[PDB]
Amino acid sequence: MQGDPEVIEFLNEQLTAELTAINQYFLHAKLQDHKGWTKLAKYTRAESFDEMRHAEVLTDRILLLDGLPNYQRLFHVRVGQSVTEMFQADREVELEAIDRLRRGIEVMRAKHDITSANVFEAILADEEHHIDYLETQLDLIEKLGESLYLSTVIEQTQPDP
Amino acid sequence: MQGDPEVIEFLNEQLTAELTAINQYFLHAKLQDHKGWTKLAKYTRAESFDEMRHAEVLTDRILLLDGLPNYQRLFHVRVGQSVTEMFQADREVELEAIDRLRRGIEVMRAKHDITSANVFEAILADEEHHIDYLETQLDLIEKLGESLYLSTVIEQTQPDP
Amino acid sequence: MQGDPEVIEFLNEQLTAELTAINQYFLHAKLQDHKGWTKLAKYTRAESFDEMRHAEVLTDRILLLDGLPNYQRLFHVRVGQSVTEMFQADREVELEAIDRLRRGIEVMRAKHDITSANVFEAILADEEHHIDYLETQLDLIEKLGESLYLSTVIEQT
Amino acid sequence: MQGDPEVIEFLNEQLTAELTAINQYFLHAKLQDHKGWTKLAKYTRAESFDEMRHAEVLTDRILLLDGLPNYQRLFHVRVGQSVTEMFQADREVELEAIDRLRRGIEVMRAKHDITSANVFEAILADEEHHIDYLETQLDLIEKLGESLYLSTVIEQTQPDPS
Amino acid sequence: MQGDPEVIEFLNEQLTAELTAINQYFLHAKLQDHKGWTKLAKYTRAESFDEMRHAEVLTDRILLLDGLPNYQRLFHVRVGQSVTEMFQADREVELEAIDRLRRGIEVMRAKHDITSANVFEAILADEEHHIDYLETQLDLIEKLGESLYLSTVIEQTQPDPS
Amino acid sequence: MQGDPEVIEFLNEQLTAELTAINQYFLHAKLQDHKGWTKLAKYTRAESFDEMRHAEVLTDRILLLDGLPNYQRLFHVRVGQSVTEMFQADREVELEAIDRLRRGIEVMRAKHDITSANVFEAILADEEHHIDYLETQLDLIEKLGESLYLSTVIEQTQPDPS
Amino acid sequence: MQGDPEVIEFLNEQLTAELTAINQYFLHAKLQDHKGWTKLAKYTRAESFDEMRHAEVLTDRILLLDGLPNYQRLFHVRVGQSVTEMFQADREVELEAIDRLRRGIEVMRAKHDITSANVFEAILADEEHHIDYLETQLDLIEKLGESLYLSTVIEQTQPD
Amino acid sequence: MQGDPEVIEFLNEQLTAELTAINQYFLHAKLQDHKGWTKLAKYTRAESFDEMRHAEVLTDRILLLDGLPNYQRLFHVRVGQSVTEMFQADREVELEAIDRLRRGIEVMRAKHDITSANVFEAILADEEHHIDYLETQLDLIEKLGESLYLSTVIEQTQPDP
Numbered sequence A, B, H: 001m002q003g004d005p006e007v008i009e010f011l012n013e014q015l016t017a018e019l020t021a022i023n024q025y026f027l028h029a030k031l032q033d034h035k036g037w038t039k040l041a042k043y044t045r046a047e048s049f050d051e052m053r054h055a056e057v058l059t060d061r062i063l064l065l066d067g068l069p070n071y072q073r074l075f076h077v078r079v080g081q082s083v084t085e086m087f088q089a090d091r092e093v094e095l096e097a098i099d100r101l102r103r104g105i106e107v108m109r110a111k112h113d114i115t116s117a118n119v120f121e122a123i124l125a126d127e128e129h130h131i132d133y134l135e136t137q138l139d140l141i142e143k144l145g146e147s148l149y150l151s152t153v154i155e156q157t158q159p160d161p
Numbered sequence C: 001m002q003g004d005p006e007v008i009e010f011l012n013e014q015l016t017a018e019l020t021a022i023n024q025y026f027l028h029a030k031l032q033d034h035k036g037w038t039k040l041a042k043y044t045r046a047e048s049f050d051e052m053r054h055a056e057v058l059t060d061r062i063l064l065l066d067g068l069p070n071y072q073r074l075f076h077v078r079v080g081q082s083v084t085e086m087f088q089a090d091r092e093v094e095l096e097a098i099d100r101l102r103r104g105i106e107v108m109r110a111k112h113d114i115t116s117a118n119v120f121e122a123i124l125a126d127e128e129h130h131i132d133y134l135e136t137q138l139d140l141i142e143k144l145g146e147s148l149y150l151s152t153v154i155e156q157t
Numbered sequence D, E, F: 001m002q003g004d005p006e007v008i009e010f011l012n013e014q015l016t017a018e019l020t021a022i023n024q025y026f027l028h029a030k031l032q033d034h035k036g037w038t039k040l041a042k043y044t045r046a047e048s049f050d051e052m053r054h055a056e057v058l059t060d061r062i063l064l065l066d067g068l069p070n071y072q073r074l075f076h077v078r079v080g081q082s083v084t085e086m087f088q089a090d091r092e093v094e095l096e097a098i099d100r101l102r103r104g105i106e107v108m109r110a111k112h113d114i115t116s117a118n119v120f121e122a123i124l125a126d127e128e129h130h131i132d133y134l135e136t137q138l139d140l141i142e143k144l145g146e147s148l149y150l151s152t153v154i155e156q157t158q159p160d161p162s
Numbered sequence G: 001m002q003g004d005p006e007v008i009e010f011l012n013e014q015l016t017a018e019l020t021a022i023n024q025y026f027l028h029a030k031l032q033d034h035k036g037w038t039k040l041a042k043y044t045r046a047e048s049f050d051e052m053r054h055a056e057v058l059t060d061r062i063l064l065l066d067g068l069p070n071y072q073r074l075f076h077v078r079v080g081q082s083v084t085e086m087f088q089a090d091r092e093v094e095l096e097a098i099d100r101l102r103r104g105i106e107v108m109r110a111k112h113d114i115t116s117a118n119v120f121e122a123i124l125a126d127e128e129h130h131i132d133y134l135e136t137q138l139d140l141i142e143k144l145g146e147s148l149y150l151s152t153v154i155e156q157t158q159p160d
């Protein structure tokens, strides 16, 4: 039971993208938490955990095919100061991930492999959901205003429910 | 208030080492999982989560001191086939970590900073206990034999109270 | 709403393989259970029940497409004394099922049918997982040796 | 200890018959359910599970005496369209089963084997009860009428108050 | 209501065999317990309790038949050092027991008495199960290796927490 | 009242003996813990607590008679690197304790005292159980093999009272 | 750790006598239950189980001393048809047991042994209590009359 | 990874001092309990158990660095008759303990070690608290007297309510 190297390198590209996304999201969460924007921090922490789940399932599938999960390679990681630029950066990361996912899914589906294809649509569906959320947030801040929108998410105490 | 760049770079080096430890321990746990090893997998995943707690407290502390943590870079990650070699790799990475931590702790205890010293001493105690566990496991396996030792890890029981 | 003959024949072949597999799994499980190897018996009988559920889904689907199930025939069943030969036989059965199912899934998706495609992908996933387990266990026993693997793993709780 | 070959081959024949019965009953359960006749489907599923238990205990007994249980060979399996023909088919199956059971028990009873005689008695009682049920239902459908009978065994409700 | 003298002698012989089985099993259980082996000790203690239950039912049945049970006679008792002698002697006593049971059941069913016969085949089935267990453990220890196998029954690894 | 010097000196000697036993057993348990062997450590810890209780009750008994318990002096405590020699050392100190206790209890029963003779009896019984367990353990480890036996203790404890 | 021949042989003799007593008690219990004297049957079953536990502790002690217990040889057992003779057999076996027990306890206490001495002390106490019960029951049965006592002990409350 | 000698005999001597302390405290508690002074006995028993925990953790640390614990040697153990001499003996023992612990903690803090220093301030804090308690007890006994203090501590062990 073995596979051709093209599917393995597709999966490894996706894995490295997921690790970089994890690091970027966690850095964003910590920075915006130090700023004082709490709800964004919680939401991006949840997103980070989701990305770890994706990385875990990808690792499982690649180790199934008797591959070598490479952890050394990383992509370019970028950070921002205001919410607009970090949202934009996450948007481009998601765009690159989804484009790579579509290309890999077509190429590998043409090879008569199925299960990796399944984990691929799972990943692309979650990425599409997150990028839609980010785009909605960007349009919201564009229409509303930076200062007041940042004032929306400030809080000091916690809710009982 | 501000911190001198030296403690910033010590914290950056410690953060890089901790991230490398995360990736190494996690990949190792996964390899033991796939090969059929169960107890060692759980112990390694517990160690990985503890190192992640270390990374969390370190990045919070450095962000407190107007720092700019860097996640792009990583050290060199080592993987092994049988238990002895990645045991040795964990040993050597922990030795490097403890040497660096001792140097850093003395250097900023000499220069008017105590909190980061407390963080490093806590991390040092944790890594000391971990390396003791590794050393006693190594002595056990060299005294008892590889096959007979590995005979007691697989259980295939799955109980529930 | 009538079915397509090659679809029906592919479903029937997969079903017959399922019946042969469940019979083989049950025989082997009983064999090690009489030997005194309880854990293998439990795991193998659980796998047999899983293949039974697979076959039930298969037959419900083939009845849905207005076809006639045939159970009068079944493939050869092979057994063994040591665990190694039976494990190898199970590996061979699962591999042949995987190859046949891949060919069937390709032609069936190409012939504009979707539901049987998703039941087939689920079956492929399950069989791939079982193949993974069998191969890792075979590697483990090859490394440890027969008596050492058999003795210290006996447990009850 | 080791058993005589004749009882071994009697046990193997009974195992084959039990496997065929399991197969046929599962067919009829699924087919009736697809027709839309829920109660008979549930009854037939219960019968199939009982025959599975019978086969399991028989296999355990035959493996006890250091035999070689084989499931490669099967008897003929017949499929019926309406309820009448499949009732008659099950009737013939149970009749041949009880015939073989009586002959085998009388044979082996004289060669100082007792426990397998007892399991043959148990399976004989089970199949006798089942065949009594089948004959009663056949007479009932004959007297009342097929259409009216199956009229009262249908419901598209699936009710569950809680 | 008086039973036949041969019935009484058969019941008495079986009772004597049961008493010998009780004594041997208890002495063994004590020996494995002193050696430190736990699972073997508890299993053979349960076996001895089951044999005592068999003696109970047999003595009730013979007492009902208006007889005088003899609690004086006892067969020979065998003791060895290793597990192999344990299993071999137990297999021997169970084999002679099964032979006596088969002869007794045949003659009892021949001479118009049933309830005693029924408890006869009950004891027969229980003892054949015990023989199967003993034989499979003998095969396992023969194949596995004495020290490697015995490493299993002994274990001090904090079993209290559950 | 006040006791004659013989009983007082024997009790003081016993106190020294159990202090030595407590220290030796605690060090053995700790070293067993460091090498990763789990169950032996907890068993030896329980033995240490038992010896602590023994020392407490003996000190109470001697102080009742307006004596002066001594805690300044000890005996020779010895340490081992492997299992065999620490088992042997425990056996040696145990044999010395048993012989001294027997002599003292005899001579002191000969000089009109029973209550302290009774507590000596209790200590004798507990120490006898400890030595029997030690001897059984030594025989098992010599028969089975050091490495294979040591494989049986290292892990797989799972204490879960809930 | 090996014990002397005298102590181990005394232990073996006591164990054999006790095993015979267990067998006798069980036999009498079953015959009492057969004829409907249920309360006596319960009492005898309890006494037999107590003797079983005593034999268990005795064989544990003898096996502790690198001994070789024997379950092969037994002493003679006696049976009775009415209460008086079975009670008398019980009392006489108790008397012989306690006499041998006193001799053994004296000898062992002279031969530098304690734990076995204590366990024989306990068994002696319990047999003293049991013989007291047997004697008081025999005297009560004598005074009252057999028929009235049998009428007293009957249950007849079998559920079915 | 083992430490130098100076630290190891400092720890071994401290362990011996702890053993002497536990024995002396237990003897004092037993004596006061016999005399009928119950609450004093309870407090002394609690102190002895705490000192035993000290000994256990300290010998655990000794073994940690691949040491050779010695239980053979013992310091002097002194006994008294009234509460005054017992308290004074305890005060002298505690004074020696604090002095030597301070010198040891400084000398090995100056030699790139942290964990042993940490357990040393733990022990030092405990000993400071204990010497405070003994000092205030002696001062109160001096202020009030002898018989009244015993009357305060003494209680009737009725055990019938």
Ligand SMILES: [Fe+2]
Pocket: A018, A051, A054, A123, A126, A127
């Ligand atoms: Fe993703």
Ligand SMILES: [Fe+2]
Pocket: A052, B049, B052
């Ligand atoms: Fe995590």
Ligand SMILES: [Fe+2]
Pocket: B050, B126, B127, B128, B130
């Ligand atoms: Fe650590």
Ligand SMILES: [Fe+2]
Pocket: C022, C048, C049, C052
């Ligand atoms: Fe099944």
Ligand SMILES: [Fe+2]
Pocket: C018, C051, C054, C055, C123, C126, C127
């Ligand atoms: Fe399947």
Ligand SMILES: [Fe+2]
Pocket: D047, D050, D051, D126, D127, D130
């Ligand atoms: Fe049935």
Ligand SMILES: [Fe+2]
Pocket: E048, E049, E052
């Ligand atoms: Fe029993």
Ligand SMILES: [Fe+2]
Pocket: E018, E051, E054, E123, E126, E127
């Ligand atoms: Fe029996």
Ligand SMILES: [Fe+2]
Pocket: F018, F051, F054, F097, F123, F127
């Ligand atoms: Fe002692």
Ligand SMILES: [Fe+2]
Pocket: H052
């Ligand atoms: Fe303690």
Ligand SMILES: [Fe+2]
Pocket: G017, G018, G021, G051, G097, G127
């Ligand atoms: Fe007795």
Ligand SMILES: [Fe+2]
Pocket: H018, H021, H051, H054, H097, H123, H127
């Ligand atoms: Fe202290």
